[PDB]
Every structure is written in structure tokens, then in C-alpha cells.
Amino acid sequence: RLTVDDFEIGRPLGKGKFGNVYLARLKESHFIVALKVLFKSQIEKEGLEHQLRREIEIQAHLQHPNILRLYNYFHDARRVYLILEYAPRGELYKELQKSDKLDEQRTATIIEELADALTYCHDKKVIHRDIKPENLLLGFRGEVKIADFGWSVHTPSLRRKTMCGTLDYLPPEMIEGRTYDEKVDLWCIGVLCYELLVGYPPFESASHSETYRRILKVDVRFPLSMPLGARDLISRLLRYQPLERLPLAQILKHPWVQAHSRRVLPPCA
Amino acid sequence: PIPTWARGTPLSQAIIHQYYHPPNLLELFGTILPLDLEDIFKTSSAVW
Ligand SMILES: Cc1cc(Nc2cc(N3CCN(C)CC3)nc(Sc3ccc(NC(=O)C4CC4)cc3)n2)[nH]n1
Structure with a gap:
């Protein structure tokens, strides 16, 4: 029509x-x-x-x-x-650029929302493969909207090999050229969580090459001011071995997420 | 010249309205038909 x-x-x-x-x-x-x-x-x-x-x-x-x-x-x-x-609130990247970082409450809320959306995605055999601040828009009450699906794939088998995403967010198994599954998305939730609270991504460096090496070594350096609960969540998501990573269901139940999340559901009916 | 509906208090109010009074999206937009690349221009990933 x-x-x-x-x-x-x-x-x-x-x-x-x-x-x-x-x-x-x-x-x-x-x-x-x-x-x-x-x-x-x-x-x-x-x-x-x-x-x-x-x-x-x-x-x-x-x-x-x-x-x-x-x-x-x-x-x-x-x-x-x-x-x-x-x-209507536009780009999270803009919001992030105002203060260069986000408080525990806004971060926690975004984490809960991504773990929820990605639960829904993975249950339908969709892997996003490019979770990062710049791919997220903001709703009327500030709710995250995953807005870019450029690297997304529908895979019933949850088996893929293609290098996808964005340098600072690449999971180690991709850099290694291994077969990978939905757990690449858990890695990116961890990078994102770090970047929103710290103001920069955890493997950032002057070259592509040095970033690759930081990623493979899982060279995460937490600032002293990092809240303890977020440090726990991030360290449990940024794992070299994909299956050791905190699953989405355990992200949602993580005490730091529970404590600081103020997620609202859009109206309906 | 930006239409009056598309800025200021009128946009704010319409956004508020739409958010709390969601419509029936189906009857508004219909089904999404499979994308036919041949008409547009000239693996496991389609098994839902
Ligand atoms: C697609 C989309 C975009 C939006 N909303 C907006 C809103 C926005 N605003 C500018 C800043 N004021 C304070 C608020 C409104 N600026 C942009 S600028 C912008 C435009 C497009 C995209 N993204 C895409 O087009 C990708 C998804 C296909 C991101 C930002 N996009 N709702 N839906």
C-alpha cells in the first residue's frame, strides 16, 4: 500500500x-x-x-x-x-560525549536492556556481532534502541567465521579466526560496560596491531575509582574462553545490575 | 523552513502522545513482504 x-x-x-x-x-x-x-x-x-x-x-x-x-x-x-x-532522544554516543562517561544507574540500565534484547535475538538465532555505543539510539524515557544491524546474521546453527565489527570491540576468537557462536555478543557487552563507565574502551591503543595484542592478552586495566560490582561484571564477561563468559541470564541477575538498573518498559495496549 | 509540527513544543507533545498511546502497527503498516531483489533492481539464514 x-x-x-x-x-x-x-x-x-x-x-x-x-x-x-x-x-x-x-x-x-x-x-x-x-x-x-x-x-x-x-x-x-x-x-x-x-x-x-x-x-x-x-x-x-x-x-x-x-x-x-x-x-x-x-x-x-x-x-x-x-x-x-x-x-526522540537521539544518539547514545552524543549523550556519552556530554560527560565523557555515564553513572552506574544509566550504565546498569543499558546493560540490563541489551542483555534482554540479545536474549530475544539469540533465542531467534540472530547474532548481532557489532554491539557498541555508536550503534545504540535512545527512546522517549532514555531506553536503549539497538539501531544498526550491518553485521547481524540469522544462523540456526550459531556457527560463523567472518571477521565483523569494530576494532576496539573485537572478541579474541574472531581475531584468532576460530569458529564462533552467540558468545561474541557477551564479549561486546563487557567492552561496552567498561567504556560507558570509564570514558574510553579497555583495549584502546595507537595502532590496530597493538589493540589486537591487548585483546588476545585480555589486557584490561581498571581505574581505581571503578565501582566494585561493575569490575566484577566486566571481568566475568571479558574472558578469553567464550564459554567462561557470564551468560545473558546471569548478566540480568548480576547484583550490580539488579542494584543500579532503573529500566522502564514502553507502554502498550 | 521546518514545518511547525516537527520542532519545539508541538513535537514534544506529539512524542509524549505517541509513546503513551501506541497505535495498531499492523493495520497502520501491513505485513513485511519478502524482499524480491529481482523486482527491486532488475544457506540456513532464510530458514526461520
Ligand atoms: C533512524 C533513527 C534516528 C532516530 N532519531 C534521531 C534523533 C536525533 N536527534 C538529534 C538530537 N536531538 C536532541 C534529538 C533528536 N538525531 C538523529 S541523527 C541519526 C540518524 C540516523 C541514525 N541511524 C540510522 O539511520 C541507522 C539505523 C539506520 C542515527 C542517528 N536521529 N530515530 N530513528
């Missing part, structure tokens, strides 16, 4: 940084959305035809309050249009 003409454009979002993304709303109902416009020529020129399909199928299959919703897509002769959830 839906086409470009069923929407009124409000304003551009992100100043080109994220492509052609607009605040918009349905003309009839005034329901507010982010409309993302892709030029087919540009998709073909970058040979991203198959990545587009993948991203849409995965996003279509995921309905969770902490996962940015894809309502639908459509296309004309010249363009592909994604109808995405509008996240």
Missing part, C-alpha cells in the same frame, strides 16, 4: 552523517517515524544488494522494546525507503 506520498517530511536527521534520514509522519494518522532513503544506483555501485536484503529480513523478524523497529520498507524506480522507529 504505502508510498512516498503517504508521508510528510519534517526535517533531516544527523546532518548527512547517517545518509538520507528524515523525521517524518504518516499524512493521515500523524504517527511519527524516521524515513531512511537509499538510492538504488548507490546500492548497486557498492554491491550492497545482498547486505540490504539481509538487514531488512533480520530487522523485520525482530520486535522488542530495546530494538529499533523496522515498520516496513517500499521502493520506487529510483529509491529504497525504510520506515524506522523514531528515537
Whole structure:
């Protein structure tokens, strides 16, 4: 049914940084959305035809309050249009840049929310493979929205080999070229938790090469001011051996997460 | 020139409204149809 003409454009979002993304709303109902416009020529020129399909199928299959919703897509002769959830508080990375770091309560809340979303993802055999601050948007009450699915994969077998993600967040088993499973996501939750509380990622260095070596050695250095409960959580997630890592169900029950999380569920009905 | 609905207090109020009065998304947006790459342009990962 839906086409470009069923929407009124409000304003551009992100100043080109994220492509052609607009605040918009349905003309009839005034329901507010982010409309993302892709030029087919540009998709073909970058040979991203198959990545587009993948991203849409995965996003279509995921309905969770902490996962940015894809309502639908459509296309004309010249363009592909994604109808995405509008996240009105914007980018966590911006929020993080105000204070360069987050308090225990805001961090704990994000951790609980990611462990919940990723429980839902893994139960559907989706591995994200690129959890990090810059992939997260913020809802009306500050609730995390996993917003980028560029490296995501639907794998019933939970067996993959491809190098994916972002240097400071790469898990050791990927760097080692091993077969890996859903536990790559647990590693990234640990890196994220560290970065939100400290202001920088735990394996950061002047070169790609030195970062790789820090990761393989699990060279985590906690500042003295790091709260004790967060230190515990992070050390239990940043494990060399994937199966030794704290599982999502134990993340949710971790005393530090329990104590400091103030997670709210979006209304319904 | 940014439409009046898309900034200031009118956007805030509409955001508040939408958040606490969620609509029926199905009847608003319909089913998501399988992506046909041939029409758009010209493994285990599809077994859900
Ligand atoms: C897709 C999306 C984006 C949003 N919301 C926003 C909101 C936002 N704001 C700017 C800052 N004010 C204070 C709040 C609103 N700035 C951006 S700038 C921006 C634009 C796009 C993306 N991400 C993507 O387009 C990826 C997911 C496909 C991230 C940030 N995006 N809701 N849904």
C-alpha cells in the first residue's frame, strides 16, 4: 500500500552523517517515524544488494522494546525507503560525549536492556556481532534502541567465521579466526560496560596491531575509582574462553545490575 | 523552513502522545513482504 506520498517530511536527521534520514509522519494518522532513503544506483555501485536484503529480513523478524523497529520498507524506480522507529532522544554516543562517561544507574540500565534484547535475538538465532555505543539510539524515557544491524546474521546453527565489527570491540576468537557462536555478543557487552563507565574502551591503543595484542592478552586495566560490582561484571564477561563468559541470564541477575538498573518498559495496549 | 509540527513544543507533545498511546502497527503498516531483489533492481539464514 504505502508510498512516498503517504508521508510528510519534517526535517533531516544527523546532518548527512547517517545518509538520507528524515523525521517524518504518516499524512493521515500523524504517527511519527524516521524515513531512511537509499538510492538504488548507490546500492548497486557498492554491491550492497545482498547486505540490504539481509538487514531488512533480520530487522523485520525482530520486535522488542530495546530494538529499533523496522515498520516496513517500499521502493520506487529510483529509491529504497525504510520506515524506522523514531528515537526522540537521539544518539547514545552524543549523550556519552556530554560527560565523557555515564553513572552506574544509566550504565546498569543499558546493560540490563541489551542483555534482554540479545536474549530475544539469540533465542531467534540472530547474532548481532557489532554491539557498541555508536550503534545504540535512545527512546522517549532514555531506553536503549539497538539501531544498526550491518553485521547481524540469522544462523540456526550459531556457527560463523567472518571477521565483523569494530576494532576496539573485537572478541579474541574472531581475531584468532576460530569458529564462533552467540558468545561474541557477551564479549561486546563487557567492552561496552567498561567504556560507558570509564570514558574510553579497555583495549584502546595507537595502532590496530597493538589493540589486537591487548585483546588476545585480555589486557584490561581498571581505574581505581571503578565501582566494585561493575569490575566484577566486566571481568566475568571479558574472558578469553567464550564459554567462561557470564551468560545473558546471569548478566540480568548480576547484583550490580539488579542494584543500579532503573529500566522502564514502553507502554502498550 | 521546518514545518511547525516537527520542532519545539508541538513535537514534544506529539512524542509524549505517541509513546503513551501506541497505535495498531499492523493495520497502520501491513505485513513485511519478502524482499524480491529481482523486482527491486532488475544457506540456513532464510530458514526461520
Ligand atoms: C533512524 C533513527 C534516528 C532516530 N532519531 C534521531 C534523533 C536525533 N536527534 C538529534 C538530537 N536531538 C536532541 C534529538 C533528536 N538525531 C538523529 S541523527 C541519526 C540518524 C540516523 C541514525 N541511524 C540510522 O539511520 C541507522 C539505523 C539506520 C542515527 C542517528 N536521529 N530515530 N530513528
